[PDB]
Symmetry: C3
Subunit: 289 residues, 3 copies
Amino acid sequence: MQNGYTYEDYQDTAKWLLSHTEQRPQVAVICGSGLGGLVNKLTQAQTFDYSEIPNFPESTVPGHAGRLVFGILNGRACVMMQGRFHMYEGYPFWKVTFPVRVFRLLGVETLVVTNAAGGLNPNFEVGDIMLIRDHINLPGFSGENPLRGPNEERFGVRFPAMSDAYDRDMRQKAHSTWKQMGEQRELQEGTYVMLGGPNFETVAECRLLRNLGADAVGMSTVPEVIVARHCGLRVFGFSLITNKVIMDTESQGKANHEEVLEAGKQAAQKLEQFVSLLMASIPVSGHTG
Amino acid sequence: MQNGYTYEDYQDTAKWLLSHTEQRPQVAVICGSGLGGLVNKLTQAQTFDYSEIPNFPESTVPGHAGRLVFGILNGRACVMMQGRFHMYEGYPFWKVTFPVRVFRLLGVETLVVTNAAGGLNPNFEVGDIMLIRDHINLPGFSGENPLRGPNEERFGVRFPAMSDAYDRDMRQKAHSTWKQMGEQRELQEGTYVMLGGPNFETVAECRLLRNLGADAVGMSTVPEVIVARHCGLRVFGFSLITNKVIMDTESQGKANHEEVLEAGKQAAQKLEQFVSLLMASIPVSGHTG
Amino acid sequence: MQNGYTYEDYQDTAKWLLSHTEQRPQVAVICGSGLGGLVNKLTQAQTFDYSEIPNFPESTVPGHAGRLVFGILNGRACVMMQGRFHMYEGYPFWKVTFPVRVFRLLGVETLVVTNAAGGLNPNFEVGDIMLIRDHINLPGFSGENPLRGPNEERFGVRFPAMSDAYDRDMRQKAHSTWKQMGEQRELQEGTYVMLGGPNFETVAECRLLRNLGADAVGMSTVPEVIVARHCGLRVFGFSLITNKVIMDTESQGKANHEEVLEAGKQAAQKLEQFVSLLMASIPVSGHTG
Ligand SMILES: O=c1[nH]cnc2c([C@@H]3O[C@H](CO)[C@@H](O)[C@H]3O)c[nH]c12
Ligand SMILES: O=c1[nH]cnc2c([C@@H]3O[C@H](CO)[C@@H](O)[C@H]3O)c[nH]c12
Ligand SMILES: O=c1[nH]cnc2c([C@@H]3O[C@H](CO)[C@@H](O)[C@H]3O)c[nH]c12
């Protein structure tokens, strides 16, 4: 059936975490494939395995550790999902996005989503960082949506708008911060398209997606962005272009999960630093003062 | 699993209605968001709340009253669904389309479907009435179809054609009737595309859908048109363009459910009159005479 | 839930077949709508109704006999599925593709898939044979995939590549063999697109699919190709263009299942001979010698 989680289920989980840590994060960060190293920048870190937290699902994908880590990143208190969940694991979207609603109940105001994606835009290179300015939700087109079923008014409204999903002011800041880093390669920005997986795309599917206007293709993030927005979380996200998708039948090679080599190795120090500097200020937003 | 309704389930429901009303409608009308006012033109009306009719599902969306109303509209006896069901409510297509098969068993010959839709075609304006000449069924592309599972030969054949879904002669009549109304704004006609919802589309999705050739986007109607056609019901339908979809990232605003303001208020008297005049004649079709 | 079949389920079924026949096929052939006649070329044939083989699903579509036939085709020992399964019958993809994994466990190395498809490419004619060089998996875009859920490492890896699904060397051979037949009509080759069904497409959907780059549209094959590739089966496939899809609203007619007339009658002797000659050699591939 539809969402099997009740409001109290999120309530209980949030209560469990609050009674087990003194940290009160405002920023929540989700780490995609091979981006699990973002965690080792945190100070005063406390790690919780998903399996010990009440209603939490579990990461079954290599590159996804399956741990919730609270810590202080460059002065700001945040919580990180070292590994996320995907629909191709057998998880329904209402299970995949469970942690987004828990964050909301913990008092989190901002959510930054990351992921590894295949490059569709020809100007993208392996190793590029693409700011997600927009997305195309293919599973959504068919009713596969985390918000399907009766609406929980306590989180948001029945018909939430998505045209303004990715925060404009945060994307301005990302660009400004990149300049300060002195990166030779420019900061990319585009549309992220989500499909189910777990197999990689055929040439025809890559050409089709590109013609639809997508810049990168992945198998996650979008459900989370929808639930986040629905409950009023400010959102920002970026894709690490781990590979160039096959656009020709004269296939030199084929995609493979070794793309973690591009993330948790190749572009480790870069985006980890990019995200740390990014914790400069929402500006915070703490009522007054 | 697939369709949980047996032929007898539709039989029973049809029998219940027939033994509770003296009205024998030939035309069935389904009212979409904010079009619930079409009901108050009926004479000798008898209302049934969906909750009292045996195997009937229930409308949970504001703008959808959830009542079956029998009445006489401009001389013709018809039955109206004051509010429909959607997949985003958690309803499977076989539940969403239940009433279409009941209508067939009541003796109904024509079904007119209405709905509120976002305008993709740039020449459309808020308040426009678009005749549905065709549709694109996105959920259908993935197997999400009201006819999935074993086929009930008593209703129709296994592989029904959809290329001739929207009656040609009725669309000629709609245009002729519009002329007689003296409307300054021309009568629109286009392709309706259905997606799951309940969130509104992103700019990228709107551009994608437009490039696919769709004129308006909605979250209903199509499943109903398929089941109707499958059982031999003549079909006609139109969309009330309640809003202009966001096609640019320089987002002035965002879509919201207040679009009922455009329907159940703004274009009330117009389409209600358009539908009343439309009950001129199939010509009826009553064997001979 | 996800795949309800365990590795032992495939093991058991493979064992059952092996202890009931002396034939050890290397090639497996799947027959689509109206192509069931490919079976009557086999020598030393042994037929098994799907209903008698342990974990086997059942064909409910006319044109699909529902029998597993072992035999010798032009010198090569093979097994044939006289009739396949489709998602529109109510079958989940993990049920639809069950036989592909059984074949793998029997020792099969090559799988040739066939099907009846509607022509999108304007240069195609009814009766044409199209080599499947690639595919677009619409249900896959939304997570509807035979590999969803935990991965069985004993069959393949979590993220299998699909860009090289259709064997290049076998498609070279198909072209060479066609020349030897002396066919006046050239051998077609293109992209196959899969959608759910069971209804036929609207004009708008046909134009949409064509613009996406598809040459033929069908309601099967793809799930099977994915599971096959995942477990290392060499794959080759072709579509019998049974009809021209409706691309204009000035609809002369509409599609219907009578397309079996084009297959199991019209192009019977041709493709049956084409497939028999095609059993020339992988070259076999039998370790050494
Ligand atoms: O080219 C790609 N296509 C689709 N998904 C991905 C990913 C993402 O990485 C994981 C697999 O490595 C998946 O979880 C997927 O979403 C990276 N590259 C691609
Ligand atoms: O722009 C739009 N996009 C998608 N659906 C709708 C609707 C339709 O109205 C209800 C929500 O107001 C939904 O039921 C939807 O199908 C109107 N406008 C749009
Ligand atoms: O034009 C077509 N569109 C979609 N599917 C098919 C088939 C295939 O044949 C069976 C129905 O005859 C279905 O099983 C379908 O996959 C043939 N032609 C078309």
